Amino acid sequence: AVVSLGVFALLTKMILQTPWQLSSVPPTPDSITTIGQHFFSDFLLPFELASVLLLMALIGAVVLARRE
Amino acid sequence: RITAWFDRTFVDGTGNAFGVVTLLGGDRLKYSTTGQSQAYILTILMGIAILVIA
Amino acid sequence: MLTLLIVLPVIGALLMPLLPERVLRSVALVIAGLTFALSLWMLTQFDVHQSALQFTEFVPWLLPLGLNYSLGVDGLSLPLIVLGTFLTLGVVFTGEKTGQRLFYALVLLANAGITGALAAQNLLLFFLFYELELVPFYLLILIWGGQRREQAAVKFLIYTAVSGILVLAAFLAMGWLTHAPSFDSADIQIAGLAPTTQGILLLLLILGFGIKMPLVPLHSWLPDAYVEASTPTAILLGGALAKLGAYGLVRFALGYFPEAWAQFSGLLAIVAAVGIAYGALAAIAQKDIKRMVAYSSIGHMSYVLLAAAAHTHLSMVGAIAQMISHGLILALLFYLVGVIETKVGTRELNVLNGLLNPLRGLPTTSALLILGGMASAGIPGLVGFVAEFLIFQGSYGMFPLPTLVAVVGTGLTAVYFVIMINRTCFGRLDNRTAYYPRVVWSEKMPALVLTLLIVFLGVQPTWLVRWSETTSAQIVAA
Amino acid sequence: GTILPETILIVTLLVVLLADLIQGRQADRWTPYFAIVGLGGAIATMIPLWTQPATISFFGSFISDHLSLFFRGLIALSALGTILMSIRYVEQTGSSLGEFMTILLTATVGGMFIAGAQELVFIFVALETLSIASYLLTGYTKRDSRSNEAALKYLLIGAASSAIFLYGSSLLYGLSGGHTQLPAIAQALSSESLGLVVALVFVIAGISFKISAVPFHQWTPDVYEGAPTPVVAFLSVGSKAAGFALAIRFLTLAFPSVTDQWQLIFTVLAILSMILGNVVALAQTSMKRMLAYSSIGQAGFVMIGFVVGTEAGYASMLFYLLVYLFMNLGAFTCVILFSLRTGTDQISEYAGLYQKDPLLTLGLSLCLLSLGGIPPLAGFFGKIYLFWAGWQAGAYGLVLLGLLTSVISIYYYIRVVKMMVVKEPQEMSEAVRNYPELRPLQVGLVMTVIATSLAGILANPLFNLVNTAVWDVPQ
Amino acid sequence: LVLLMGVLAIYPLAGSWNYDDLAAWAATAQVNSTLITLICLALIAGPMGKCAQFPLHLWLD
Ligand SMILES: CCCCCCCCCCCCCCCC(=O)OC[C@H](CO[C@@H]1O[C@H](CS(=O)(=O)O)[C@@H](O)[C@H](O)[C@H]1O)OC(=O)CCCCCCCCCCCCCCC
Ligand SMILES: CCCCCCCCCCCCCCCC(=O)OC[C@H](CO[C@@H]1O[C@H](CS(=O)(=O)O)[C@@H](O)[C@H](O)[C@H]1O)OC(=O)CCCCCCCCCCCCCCC
Ligand SMILES: CCCCCCCCCCCCCCCCCC(=O)O[C@@H](COC(=O)CCCCCCCCCCCCCCC)COP(=O)(O)OC[C@H](O)CO
């Protein structure tokens, strides 16, 4: 309880103190086509490695929860 | 009979105490690994909010 | 040339595995004798009046660490190497009759480390060979030994490990406070800096080498590790490591801080006098023989500190002679006490008795014991008197009271050695506990050779001194 | 774009599939090879792009400089050494070997990717790829309750550590406008604020979990006892390699070195690691737990390489991290070889091994002494370079603590050699009194033991390598 | 052994020990009174014990 309250107070002070850069320009409405552009231009390594992540997770979970 | 006794008690002992202490400091500090994962997460959370203070 | 002295024991150690037993013992003898003979040949070609390094070898090894493989032998260093190789030959000759494959390996590795550490003109390389000496002696104390091996061995280990620390802590420091690369000695390593720091470095070197030498309050591993060690282990350990420590102290702490040594001399003389008196008075009270001999080792090593506390050209020839004399005498005494403990089966001073009568009671190891005990004390005709008198004559022009205290310490040494000889050689044999086994001919050869060398170097002492006469001049007169 | 730096990873990736499909068809397979061959090909693929090209970036999302190649080869070699040990170990257990090597190779791929990654998203993805496979490997032997409790404990600690690291990453993305890149964040925020300090500490909380810096250490003593021993061998060499690689690539390049409060934080963690991991290791009864606390201590040693970063502390850190591979793979191979034969037990059961099996003793004592820092051996020069790189910078106290802890470590490292050699036929343990009398295990043991004894004096060839790797760290 | 202390402190004063250099030295000597008092007391105590004199006389009995 005390560590949670202290960490929350610390984070709240950090959030209320730092001067974020608001950059007042309206966002984009077509937010899915942009995510589609970032999967294969910028975030290609993570998009490709998430497949192997899912495969290894499936393998290991079937092995751990198997019945024998 | 004094000197030998001194050597057998004060000098030798003074050289052994260190060792003995270093044994105790290990025998009664293993209990910091309490075996409770929630305690480990408490120590990880005490790491933060303290280095953040220092 | 020195590379041979360092590599041949290493080769024998690496060759002790994968070798058949008969060949195991024969080849150990061969390697030890070869290294020894090479040492003697080097000693003959050591042509003197040089005042510089000889047999030097320089190879660049580990540039990002300094650590150039840079050997080189001087007048202070070569007699110690010959001593180490002689003791190694003897220890291999009277090796253990159990697990005798990991013995010759470790003994040869220990000799390699000693010979390297002596003939190394590189600080970090010296420390390499020092901490190389650290562990195999732990293994020797641990496998072969007495009831209380483990404790004893552990003690030695740590008091040597800590030693390394201090030495290393005082090399790195004094290797960087002078912004010098290439830690190798007799080189860019030039102190030339402000006081209050030379003091700290000198104290670090004193406490790192005085703990192995050993000095007065840092000695508390010596009685435990000499008594719980078999006789070859005791001989090798005593000679080799004690001389390594003393050599380190003399060489480094006198060739690097001659301004701080001249200021700490006043305290080191009193510390050495207290050490001699302390060793003697603590030996007088002991009722086990090996303990008396260990405190003998402490007392005889404090003479080197008293000698070095005075910068006299004479008091350093005397220091080297005392190192050699203590090596020979401690080897003889440990060998004789090991023989006695083996044949009699007990080592106390209240059940040993009458070991000097002809037929039933061990008389040529007792005669040698009386001759080694009187050599240890100050008795002319033997080596100990020559060494101690050189030290005394060199140390009286300086502080005269610590020299007088050292003379009193020699008297007390005579006291407790007479105690041991009376309760060991004189008296009558107990006629239920007698029937000691016989002593075979090639089992009292090492004692009978050490005795001949001791009685020779005491009546014709030039052959003890003619090697370190100009080197000591180069050491102190600089 | 410039997918050449990936022909080292994709090779291993292909193996992950091929050593998997073969387990789908065959189920009694020889996949231990063509997995050693896969890692060998992945390592041999680094020679063409170690010196021939300059430093290249995938899309800003990955970099293939010499430091990246160093850490990638390090993790691949750790996996190669672990595959050898785990053949007769998990086969002796009633479990499969292909479904284990796929997980091990995926953990390897994650560790190799996290080395050269320089973007928030990809860093997170590589770290989590490592962590999930680590959990799965820890809980592999699902018959033993210790393995299951260790996997649960490790998962609950690692997932919380990853949540903290992710909070730090989100803060770091928000402070510097956008810029998920690492080098584009240093250019954006170049001033200490409260947000930057909080992000720094929250990243440290997830780094120190990987590199086992106390107080983020309390899982290794409970995971090393639980996990299968070859998993522990890969976990003490490869996981620390990935953690230190990520720490160098993150702290130096992302957190603007103007905010070098992490040097203070890591001084604290290194002092605490040296003090704890060596004092508590001194009172242990099992070999795996002793090696866990030893590993904490050695991480504390390494953490005085990049806490005084001076292009010689980085080289000292990398050299010790390279030697640590040979030391620990060889110290775990002998532990596996002993627990396989009859023992399956703790330190007290080692008493009297010199009579029955001398090769295992000569192989384990060498590695324990190397870990202790005994002259000529791989560990002595590693520690001497660590300590001189610490004096040459100004950290007297850190090095003077490292030396005392090195003595404390010599004590409990030689306490095992005690049992292995001292005993006479009456003091053999009950596990040696009936000691009986697997080729890859021996051919890995011999190799790591001959490497830990020769990479100390033949150290000059692998000092130029470390130096050309260190040339890439910013300062 | 106290004779050794005496013979040890007669060298800086006489530069030799030959019973003739000592004779010449003692002929023309003007050094401190207590110093020669002490060194000659040591030179006495040597033969004092060697010749079985009080108090070092029980050894003869
Ligand atoms: C203080 C001065 C020291 C100088 C003395 C020099 C040491 C003696 C030299 C020996 C020469 C080598 C051969 C010795 C072995 C041998 O032949 O047979 C061994 C047998 C001994 O008995 C044997 O003893 C053997 C056990 S042991 O050898 O005695 O250890 C065993 O074989 C069996 O018991 C038994 O027959 O004969 C002896 O050696 C005893 C005679 C030799 C010892 C003499 C000592 C008596 C004098 C001591 C004081 C001298 C005073 C004069 C001025 C100093
Ligand atoms: C100033 C520096 C230079 C000066 C020299 C240094 C001072 C030396 C003085 C000698 C001191 C005696 C040593 C102590 C012995 C001991 O520990 O126990 C006492 C021993 C018994 O020890 C026992 O000896 C036993 C063996 S044995 O059978 O006795 O031999 C043994 O079993 C037992 O354990 C052991 O306790 O018995 C003795 O006292 C014998 C000693 C006889 C010495 C004669 C005196 C010599 C000095 C002349 C004095 C002149 C002045 C007198 C007053 C006017
Ligand atoms: C200032 C007083 C001077 C008087 C003389 C004292 C000078 C002594 C110098 C200290 C040398 C260190 C001695 C370490 C003692 C080791 C002996 C020992 O017994 O080892 C024990 C354990 O050893 C250790 O734990 C290793 C840790 C020792 C570390 C000691 C370092 C001391 C160095 C002091 C430096 C302080 C820093 C000051 C800097 C400003 C085991 O004890 P035991 O009874 O169990 O033995 C049997 C064995 O256990 C069975 O196998």
Q: What is the 3-state secondary structure (H, E, C) of E1-61?
A: CHHHHHHHCCHHHHCCCCCCHHHHHHHCCCCCHHHHHHHHHHHHHHHHHHCCECCECCCCC
For residue C360, the CA-to-ligand 1 centroid distance in Å is 12
Sign for the CA dihedral angle at A17, A20, A26, A30 comes to: negative
Torsion from C-alpha of D82, D49, D185, D128, nearest 10 degrees: -20
CA distance D95 to D102: 14
**Residues of D whose CB is below 8 A from C150:** 418, 422
Q: Do D404 and C129 make contact, defined as CB atoms within 8 angstroms?
A: no
Name residue, tokens 């324990």: D368
What are the C-alpha distances in Å from E43 to residues D470, E10, E32? 75, 10, 17
CA distance A42 to A36: 10
Subunits with 3+ Cβ pairs within 8 Å of B are: A, C, D
Cβ(C365) – ligand 1 distance below 6 Å = yes
Interchain contact C/D (3 or more Cβ pairs less than 8 Å): yes
Interchain contact C/A (3 or more Cβ pairs less than 8 Å): no
**Residues of A whose CB is below 8 A from B50:** none
- Specify whether the CB–CB gap between C357 and C429 falls below 8 A: yes
- Specify whether the CB–CB gap between C307 and C320 falls below 8 A: no
Resolution in A: 3.2
What are the C-alpha distances in Å from C152 to residues B23, C102, C223, C475, D120? 17, 20, 9, 37, 56
Own/partner contacts of C23-32, CB < 8 Å, gap of 24 or more, are: C24/C100, C24/C101, C24/C104, C25/C95, C25/C100, C25/C104, C28/C92, C28/C95, C28/C104, C28/C107, C28/C108, C29/C92, C29/C93, C31/C108, C32/C85, C32/C88, C32/C89, C32/C92, C32/C93, C32/C108, C32/C111
For residue E1, the CA-to-ligand 2 centroid distance in Å is 15
Q: A27, C308, C98, E21: which is closest to D422 by C-alpha?
A: C98
CA distance D334 to D291: 12
Q: D72, D68, D115, D73: which is closest to D243 by C-alpha?
A: D115
For residue D301, the CA-to-ligand 3 centroid distance in Å is 22
Which residue in B1, B2, B3 has the most chain C C-beta atoms within 10 A of its own C-beta, making it the best mutation to test that interface?
B3
For residue C253, give how far its alpha carbon lies from the nearest alpha carbon of chain D (Å).
Answer: 21
Provide the CB-side half-sphere exposure for E46 (13 A, CA). 13
CA distance C405 to C407: 5
- Specify whether the CB–CB gap between C299 and C308 falls below 8 A: no
Atom 40 (ligand 3) nearest CA: D400
CA distance C312 to C477: 8
Name residue, tokens 């964040």: D185
Closest-approaching ligand to the CA atom of C455: 1
Interchain contact D/A (3 or more Cβ pairs less than 8 Å): yes
Burial of B16 per CB tally in 10 Å (0-12, 13-18, 19+):
middle
β-strand partners of C58: C70
∠ CA C294-C298-C299, rounded to 5°: 115
For residue D392, give how far its alpha carbon lies from the nearest alpha carbon of chain C (Å).
Answer: 6
Q: Which of residues 8-37 of A touch B (CB under 8 A)?
A: 10
User: What amino acid is encoded at B3 in this protein?
Assistant: T
Cβ(C159) – ligand 3 distance below 6 Å = yes
The answer to whether residue D150 neighbours chain A at the CB level (below 8 Å) is no
What are the C-alpha distances in Å from C72 to residues C81, C184, C223, C255? 12, 11, 34, 16
Question: φ, ψ for residue C239 (rounded to 5)?
Answer: -50, -65
Nearest atom of ligand 3 to the alpha carbon of C211: 9
β-strand partners of C288: C348
Three-state secondary-structure class, residue A21: coil
- Specify whether the CB–CB gap between C11 and C65 falls below 8 A: no
For residue C408, the CA-to-ligand 2 centroid distance in Å is 13
Atom 48 (ligand 3) nearest CA: C151
- Specify whether the CB–CB gap between C312 and C335 falls below 8 A: no
Which residue in C69, C100, C102, C135 has the most chain D C-beta atoms within 10 A of its own C-beta, making it the best mutation to test that interface?
C135
What are the C-alpha distances in Å from D5 to residues C116, D8, D130? 48, 7, 20
Burial of C196 per CB tally in 10 Å (0-12, 13-18, 19+):
exposed
The answer to whether residue B22 neighbours chain C at the CB level (below 8 Å) is no
**Structure-determination approach:** cryo-EM
- Per-residue DSSP letter, A26: -
User: What amino acid is encoded at C247 in this protein?
Assistant: Y
CA distance D327 to D331: 6
CA distance D225 to D153: 12
Q: Do B41 and D222 make contact, defined as CB atoms within 8 angstroms?
A: no
- Per-residue DSSP letter, A43: S
**Residues of D whose CB is below 8 A from A49:** 109-110, 113, 122, 125-126, 129
The two three-digit tokens of residue D389, written as one number: 């790189």
For residue A15, give how far its alpha carbon lies from the nearest alpha carbon of chain B (Å).
Answer: 15
Query: How many C-beta atoms surround the C-beta of residue A34 within 10 A?
Result: 10
CA distance D122 to D181: 10
- Specify whether the CB–CB gap between C177 and C185 falls below 8 A: no
**Residues of C whose CB is below 8 A from B4:** 281-282, 284-286
Biggest CA–CA distance in chain A, Å, is 60
For residue D213, give how far its alpha carbon lies from the nearest alpha carbon of chain A (Å).
Answer: 21
Q: D238, D171, D162: which is closest to D205 by C-alpha?
A: D162
Cβ(C424) – ligand 1 distance below 6 Å = no
Q: D374, D370, D339: which is closest to D357 by C-alpha?
A: D339
Residue-number span of the structural domain to which B16 is assigned = 1-54
| Angle subtended by helix axes D36-44 and D9-25, to nearest 10 | 160
For residue C138, give how far its alpha carbon lies from the nearest alpha carbon of chain B (Å).
Answer: 17
Q: Do A43 and D122 make contact, defined as CB atoms within 8 angstroms?
A: yes
∠ CA C233-C234-C238, rounded to 5°: 115
Q: Do A3 and B42 make contact, defined as CB atoms within 8 angstroms?
A: yes
For residue C168, give how far its alpha carbon lies from the nearest alpha carbon of chain D (Å).
Answer: 9
CA distance D186 to D181: 9
- Specify whether the CB–CB gap between D116 and D8 falls below 8 A: no
Q: How far is C-alpha D447 from the geometric centre of its chain's CA atoms?
A: 18
The two three-digit tokens of residue C166, written as one number: 């201090």
The two three-digit tokens of residue C301, written as one number: 């090593």
| Angle subtended by helix axes C258-285 and C401-422, to nearest 10 | 30
Q: Which residue of A has its CA nearest to D142?
A: A64
The 3 state secondary structure assigned to chain D is CCCHHHCCHHHHHHHHHHHHHHHHHCCCCCCCCCCHHHHHHHHHCCHHHCCCCCCCECCCCCECCHHHHHHHHHHHHHHHHHHHHCHHHHHHCCCCCHHHHHHHHHHHHHHHHHHHCCEHHHHHHHHHHHHHHHHHHHCCCCCCHHHHHHHHHHHHHHHHHHHHHHHHHHHHHHHCCCCCECHHHHCCCCCCCHHHHHHHHHHHHHHHHHHCCCCCCCCHHHHHHHCCHHHHHHHHHHHHHHHHHHHHHHHHCCCCCCCCCHHHHHHHHHHHHHHHHHHCCCCCCCHHHHHHHHHHHHHHHHCCCCCCCCCCHHHHHHHHHHHHHHHHHHHHHHHHHHHHHCCCCCHHHHCCHHHHCHHHHHHHHHHHHHHHCCCCCHHHHHHHHHHHHHHCCCCHHHHHHHHHHHHHHHHHHHHHHHHHHHCCCCCCCCCCCCCCCCHHHHHHHHHHHHHHHHCCCCCCHHHHHHHHHHCCCCC
Pocket test for ligand 1, best of C342, C357, C364, C453 (most atoms within 8 A of CB): C364
| Angle subtended by helix axes D461-470 and D313-341, to nearest 10 | 120
∠ CA D206-D208-D212, rounded to 5°: 130
Cβ(C364) – ligand 1 distance below 6 Å = yes
**Residues of B whose CB is below 8 A from D164:** 44, 48
Sign for the CA dihedral angle at C297, C302, C304, C305 comes to: positive
CA distance D382 to A65: 44
Pocket test for ligand 2, best of C295, C415, C418, C420 (most atoms within 8 A of CB): C415
User: What amino acid is encoded at D242 in this protein?
Assistant: A
- Helix (H), strand (E) at residue A39: helix A31-40
Atom 19 (ligand 2) nearest CA: C419
CA distance C255 to D119: 56
Burial of E12 per CB tally in 10 Å (0-12, 13-18, 19+):
exposed
Residues in chain E: 61
Which residue in C6, C140, C143 has the most chain D C-beta atoms within 10 A of its own C-beta, making it the best mutation to test that interface?
C143
Which residue in C140, C155, C168 has the most chain D C-beta atoms within 10 A of its own C-beta, making it the best mutation to test that interface?
C168
CA distance E32 to E24: 17
Provide the CB-side half-sphere exposure for D380 (13 A, CA). 27
Own/partner contacts of D396-400, CB < 8 Å, gap of 24 or more, are: D397/D271, D398/D267, D398/D270, D398/D271, D398/D304, D398/D307, D398/D308, D399/C172, D399/D304, D400/C169
Q: D197, D348, D179, D208: which is closest to D268 by C-alpha?
A: D208
**Residues of E whose CB is below 8 A from C393:** 8, 11
The string over D142-180, giving b where at least 16 C-beta atoms fall within 10 Å of a residue's C-beta and e elsewhere, is beeeebbbbbebbbbbbebbbebbbbbbebbbebbeebb
If one counts the domains in chain B, the total is: 1
Three-state secondary-structure class, residue B17: helix
Question: φ, ψ for residue D119 (rounded to 5)?
Answer: -145, 145
CA distance D158 to D206: 8
